Design an enzyme around this catalytic site. Structure first.
Site, PDB file in Angstrom:
ATOM      1  N   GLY A 125     -21.951  11.397  -1.279  1.00 24.39           N
ATOM      2  CA  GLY A 125     -22.313  11.300   0.133  1.00 24.39           C
ATOM      3  C   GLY A 125     -21.982   9.932   0.692  1.00 24.39           C
ATOM      4  N   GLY A 126     -22.921   9.375   1.457  1.00 29.05           N
ATOM      5  CA  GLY A 126     -22.742   8.054   2.021  1.00 29.05           C
ATOM      6  C   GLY A 126     -22.475   7.024   0.944  1.00 29.05           C
ATOM      7  N   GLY A 324      17.807   4.022   1.842  1.00 26.94           N
ATOM      8  CA  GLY A 324      16.637   3.780   2.670  1.00 26.94           C
ATOM      9  C   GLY A 324      15.525   3.064   1.928  1.00 26.94           C
ATOM     10  N   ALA A 325      15.316   3.423   0.655  1.00 25.89           N
ATOM     11  CA  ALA A 325      14.290   2.776  -0.160  1.00 25.89           C
ATOM     12  C   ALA A 325      14.605   1.306  -0.417  1.00 25.89           C
ATOM     13  CB  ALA A 325      14.130   3.507  -1.495  1.00 25.89           C
TER      14      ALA A 325
HETATM   15  O1  LIG Z   1     -25.485  10.849   2.064  1.00 29.50           O
HETATM   16  C1  LIG Z   1     -25.562  12.034   2.515  1.00 29.50           C
HETATM   17  O2  LIG Z   1     -26.090  12.949   1.823  1.00 29.50           O
HETATM   18  C2  LIG Z   1     -25.026  12.390   3.898  1.00 29.50           C
HETATM   19  C3  LIG Z   1     -23.820  11.538   4.232  1.00 29.50           C
HETATM   20  C4  LIG Z   1     -22.538  11.933   3.877  1.00 29.50           C
HETATM   21  C5  LIG Z   1     -21.454  11.124   4.193  1.00 29.50           C
HETATM   22  C6  LIG Z   1     -21.682   9.929   4.886  1.00 29.50           C
HETATM   23  O3  LIG Z   1     -20.675   9.013   5.244  1.00 29.50           O
HETATM   24  C7  LIG Z   1     -19.473   9.454   5.817  1.00 29.50           C
HETATM   25  C8  LIG Z   1     -18.591   8.460   6.240  1.00 29.50           C
HETATM   26  N1  LIG Z   1     -17.418   8.741   6.777  1.00 29.50           N
HETATM   27  C9  LIG Z   1     -17.078  10.032   6.916  1.00 29.50           C
HETATM   28  C10 LIG Z   1     -15.836  10.357   7.489  1.00 29.50           C
HETATM   29  C11 LIG Z   1     -15.475  11.685   7.621  1.00 29.50           C
HETATM   30 CL1  LIG Z   1     -13.900  12.067   8.341  1.00 29.50          CL
HETATM   31  C12 LIG Z   1     -16.315  12.711   7.201  1.00 29.50           C
HETATM   32  C13 LIG Z   1     -17.545  12.393   6.640  1.00 29.50           C
HETATM   33  C14 LIG Z   1     -17.932  11.032   6.497  1.00 29.50           C
HETATM   34  N2  LIG Z   1     -19.129  10.723   5.960  1.00 29.50           N
HETATM   35  C15 LIG Z   1     -22.979   9.557   5.206  1.00 29.50           C
HETATM   36  C16 LIG Z   1     -24.050  10.356   4.886  1.00 29.50           C
HETATM   37  O1  LIG Z   2      20.778   6.464   7.447  1.00 27.25           O
HETATM   38  C1  LIG Z   2      21.050   6.914   6.288  1.00 27.25           C
HETATM   39  O2  LIG Z   2      21.948   7.796   6.145  1.00 27.25           O
HETATM   40  C2  LIG Z   2      20.285   6.409   5.056  1.00 27.25           C
HETATM   41  C3  LIG Z   2      18.884   5.876   5.402  1.00 27.25           C
HETATM   42  C4  LIG Z   2      17.724   6.619   5.145  1.00 27.25           C
HETATM   43  C5  LIG Z   2      16.481   6.099   5.486  1.00 27.25           C
HETATM   44  C6  LIG Z   2      16.375   4.824   6.056  1.00 27.25           C
HETATM   45  O3  LIG Z   2      15.160   4.217   6.454  1.00 27.25           O
HETATM   46  C7  LIG Z   2      14.002   4.276   5.660  1.00 27.25           C
HETATM   47  C8  LIG Z   2      12.870   3.610   6.138  1.00 27.25           C
HETATM   48  N1  LIG Z   2      11.726   3.596   5.474  1.00 27.25           N
HETATM   49  C9  LIG Z   2      11.674   4.258   4.307  1.00 27.25           C
HETATM   50  C10 LIG Z   2      10.472   4.276   3.573  1.00 27.25           C
HETATM   51  C11 LIG Z   2      10.422   4.958   2.359  1.00 27.25           C
HETATM   52 CL1  LIG Z   2       8.915   4.969   1.414  1.00 27.25          CL
HETATM   53  C12 LIG Z   2      11.542   5.627   1.862  1.00 27.25           C
HETATM   54  C13 LIG Z   2      12.724   5.614   2.591  1.00 27.25           C
HETATM   55  C14 LIG Z   2      12.784   4.921   3.821  1.00 27.25           C
HETATM   56  N2  LIG Z   2      13.934   4.925   4.507  1.00 27.25           N
HETATM   57  C15 LIG Z   2      17.534   4.102   6.320  1.00 27.25           C
HETATM   58  C16 LIG Z   2      18.779   4.618   5.990  1.00 27.25           C
END
Ligand SMILES: O=C(O)Cc1ccc(Oc2cnc3cc(Cl)ccc3n2)cc1
Ligand SMILES: O=C(O)Cc1ccc(Oc2cnc3cc(Cl)ccc3n2)cc1
Lengths: 424, 426
Positions: A125-126, A324-325
């Site tokens: 939970g929390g 790209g990587a």
């Molecule tokens: O403790 C317990 O039994 C009840 C409880 C459960 C969770 C909690 O905290 C949070 C924080 N962020 C959250 C974000 C999303 Cl998107 C959905 C749920 C989330 N819940 C606080 C209290």
């Molecule tokens: O243009 C083309 O033919 C080749 C090409 C493709 C992609 C690209 O840019 C990027 C940017 N961010 C990236 C992040 C991750 Cl984790 C992996 C790949 C990523 N690639 C640049 C050039």
């Protein structure tokens, strides 16, 4: 005392005889305290798993919020020892609201003071979201949520020890020391396989680079395994390491390894921890049935992380960095501090045969079938004569220096040492 | 290749007669121009699909960067029109490096000037990550991103793509002001769009559009992605506002990995450009992944807490029907410093439903009941849990709801609170 006694756990974690409670002990299910961790003033709170299984209530949360305010004012690290089923159902919305105020203290502290979470019992939970908002989570095995935990300890007392070492990495970072750096130099290239096509585990290389007498605190070791990240020390200085691991998925980036890398970069940039980026990446992989959405969204976040980064970050290309990587793995376009390459490294858009197949496809398709595989092989040859290697990239400007692998630590340390502490 | 000509595309998008080229035309693959969009000075660049399929090279990338530097220095929005299969392979690593410089410029502009992408043709590799780095991505039907949630708005055609792109320049750069007289002139019994049964589902989007101005579009983002969560830009007495609303029609309105991630991006984006938020809450829980993976909802749930927690623009919360548990905290609650929290009179603010809670707090008094009576015992036990817990009156006492409001003044009460809050702090 019961093993779950909170004052027992606070005492195991802190330096002996340093504990100083921040409030009278009571039935709230939280005990907070000031102590030292190898001399650093640290604030810590522990949930009392002996009262209602550690369920959080209004007054327990008010102790945690007070401890955060104490730690924010001292500029002290704050450690939370967690063992709790969640919020106290009976206290209703009041307890929900107070748990919310805990999160809001954690958000205020975020990037200001370091926050470590040591999870030693059942946490739900929390009490699972609490740690998720801190910088590093240590989990004792005595406790399905993939990616959330950073370091799995051996047991409850080993968890306190890794947690103590995290405090020292974040608040006792040190100076780089060019003289220890050269004492530790070795031929790290020797750890490579003789085949450029063979795969290897990159962690021995990370281990060679980092100081011999200090552990490598790898984060999220079992999540997104084509990417290795963690903290360590390089000539006594806390450094963050990021390294493609060609043993898993051929070392390619994908949606999860991009997220793992990006969250780590942001964490080190927040606390002034320079980065060493070891690069051996052949491309990137899509999703499970070929969805590029995650690798596009997550890969953009990785670019953004290096782009906005302001600490020293140095790249070392060991074998190959393609396409790209190549850009995302801390390249010059994204303001890398320096880029090094081992002498045999390849900096290209793709493999030479793959790249000829596309660049001269019309030429290849017009040639007779009994001469294509012969012309393709040779076209690929003159291609590597003008492209491929360090010498090309040195001339373009995307590699600053070809370095002898026997001098990797010195070169890296020297490059890190002359960057500024900020701006890049 | 007339359809795809950069200067034709650049002018179907700018105001008639406004195009002023930033450089002299060539075969680089990029044309960058200045111009106006309903009066606002705007920079724009278009990849040239009629040259090598718009493949990106060292000199076209330099145009885009000088376009970025111009827009950054003039503090002007910059719009990119994308049609390109990637980097020029014949230019080798020089072009990889130049593509990255485009990225780096997009990262410098991030948060600082709005960036809108109109994807009109195929956009692959380098030209797929370009749009990924900007704030809002419009896509015409005759295209695709390749190398989901990457694309925010789908258009009916290329000219509609330019039309939706122009509204967005106006939403970000012509935000207006609130107007008490216009806001009240629009009040309606918004409560009437709910079902009369407290457990039926409904589409939240008629609620949202009845708060926003009666005949101004609501530019929803990512509608087919994470559909338990609705987000988008609209106008509220003429002021640009962002809306986040749980959608009870999908996954019961719960939060999950994708919906948390959807909300967190959008909150950070309105926060960057000074856009107030309206958070409409009707959420009963949160849900894990397909294989019972909670890792997603935890990490991305935490990012939602962080988005709202650090947020500084006015952000108002309205509890329509129910808000429960951990999802209550994350949906812009008082603990995360919401500007103001309203509730309709019947709303429920609780840890969980009364029958759920009583089933836990009294697991053993009910298991010990005779089977045919363990239910009368459950319903009477629940009825006394909610003489104490759950209601708006209890929540006002605690202080997690600021005002119970007549639903017939929803629009004017939300406007009032947004208008009178500080522009920053919170
Ligand atoms: O403790 C317990 O039994 C009840 C409880 C459960 C969770 C909690 O905290 C949070 C924080 N962020 C959250 C974000 C999303 Cl998107 C959905 C749920 C989330 N819940 C606080 C209290
Ligand atoms: O243009 C083309 O033919 C080749 C090409 C493709 C992609 C690209 O840019 C990027 C940017 N961010 C990236 C992040 C991750 Cl984790 C992996 C790949 C990523 N690639 C640049 C050039």
């Amino acid at each position: 005392l019961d093993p779950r006694d909170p004052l027992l756990r606070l005492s195991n974690f802190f330096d002996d005889g340093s504990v100083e409670l921040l409030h009278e002990r009571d039935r709230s299910g939280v005990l907070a305290a000031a102590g030292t961790v190898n001399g650093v003033r640290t604030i810590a709170f522990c949930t009392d798993g002996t009262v209602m299984g550690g369920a959080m209530g209004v007054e327990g949360c008010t102790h945690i919020v007070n401890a955060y305010d104490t730690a924010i004012e001292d500029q002290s690290p704050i450690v939370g020892i967690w063992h709790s089923g969640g919020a106290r159902l009976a206290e209703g919305v009041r307890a929900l609201h107070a748990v919310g105020q805990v999160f809001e203290a954690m958000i205020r502290a975020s990037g200001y003071i370091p926050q470590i979470s040591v999870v030693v019992g059942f946490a739900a939970g929390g009490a699972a979201y609490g740690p998720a908002l801190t910088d590093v989570v240590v989990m004792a095995p005595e406790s399905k949520k993939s990616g959330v935990c950073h370091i799995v300890a051996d047991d409850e007392l080993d968890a306190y020890d890794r947690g103590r070492r995290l405090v020292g990495l974040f608040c006792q970072q040190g100076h780089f020391d060019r003289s220890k750096a050269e004492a530790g130099d070795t031929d790290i290239h020797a750890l490579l396989p003789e085949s450029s096509r063979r795969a290897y585990d990159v962690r021995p290389i990370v281990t060679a680079i980092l100081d011999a007498d200090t552990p490598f605190d790898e984060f999220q070791a079992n999540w997104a395994p084509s990417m290795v990240v963690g903290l360590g020390r390089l000539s006594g200085r806390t450094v963050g390491v990021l390294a493609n691991n060609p043993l898993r998925l051929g070392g390619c980036l994908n949606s999860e390894s991009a997220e793992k890398a990006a969250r780590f970069v942001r964490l080190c940039d927040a606390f002034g921890i320079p980065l060493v980026v070891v690069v051996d990446v052949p491309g990137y992989l899509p999703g499970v049935d070929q969805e590029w959405g995650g690798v596009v969204r997550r890969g953009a976040k990785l670019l953004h992380a290096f782009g906005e980064c302001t600490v020293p970050r140095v790249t070392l290309v060991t074998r190959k960095t393609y396409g790209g990587a190549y850009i995302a793995m801390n390249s010059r376009s994204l303001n890398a501090t320096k880029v090094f390459a081992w002498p045999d490294a390849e900096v290209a858009v793709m493999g030479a045969k793959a790249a000829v197949g596309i660049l001269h496809k019309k030429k290849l398709a017009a040639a007779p079938e009994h001469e294509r595989e012969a012309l393709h092989d040779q076209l690929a040859a003159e291609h590597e004569r003008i492209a491929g290697g360090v010498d090309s990239a040195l001339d373009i400007g995307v590699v600053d220096e070809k370095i002898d692998p026997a001098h990797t630590r010195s070169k890296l340390t020297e490059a890190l040492a002359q960057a500024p502490a900020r701006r890049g």
